Design a protein around this ligand. Sequence first.
Ligand SMILES: COc1cccc(-n2c(N)c(C(N)=O)c3nc4ccccc4nc32)c1
Length: 266
Amino acid sequence: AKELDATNISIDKVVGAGEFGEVCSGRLKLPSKKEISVAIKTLKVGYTEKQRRDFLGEASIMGQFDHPNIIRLEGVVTKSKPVMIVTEYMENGSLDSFLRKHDAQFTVIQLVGMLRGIASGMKYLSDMGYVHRDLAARNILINSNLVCKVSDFPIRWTSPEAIAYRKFTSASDVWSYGIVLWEVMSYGERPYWEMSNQDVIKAVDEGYRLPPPMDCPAALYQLMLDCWQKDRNNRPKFEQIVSILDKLIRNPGSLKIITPSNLLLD
Ligand SMILES: COc1cccc(-n2c(N)c(C(N)=O)c3nc4ccccc4nc32)c1
């Protein structure tokens, strides 16, 4: 993490509440004098040394990644207070809340573009040996041009083997990605709705899966089912997912084929 000079940071408005303090939007002046929009997280006054370590830990992890679909760390402020993390700004906020405002208003190709971006970011994360463990639409940010980026460095999003015995792998992230795919095509519906956690676990283990979202292309529902294979070795790798979505983008016509209990037994 680059140490930023605090005189280069302006804080304009509060846009959210974080675990360790406020989230704000603002501006950062780069060494080149270019001014960019940024998000700013501040560590709350009177922090404990553990809180400081956990706070800055996110920056340490995020700083290892340089990719168009991973939130960009601009730097940190530690030598003055409040302590701060500064990232690129994403005008349209969290993906799930954004889609909920626009139910059925985007084209399939727009949605597939979002999904391809998320998959590309995950492909790089997994390439780097990072298992996210919290991949969910609420942890994806989306900017003014609808570019989606992985952020946040959860039973409904977690693979059965990770729930069963903490077997977290890039293949359990692929499971989570399948859930994100369902979330996106459902415009931010909650996975498994408000089912009791114990029933989500039992149903999924028994082979039940989320149903196809309204007007969901068959190709995309099949990709969900592939991400949700019980045997994690049968799930696609993220490189394959990116390839699949790139084909659908290249062949928009294929997206026109559309797909007892709420959940379906696969
Ligand atoms: C500045 O440090 C970080 C680290 C991780 C995520 C974010 N982060 C951003 N870059 C955001 C943005 N809109 O650009 C944003 N909106 C948020 C809204 C609500 C809660 C947390 C948020 N968190 C946010 C900011």
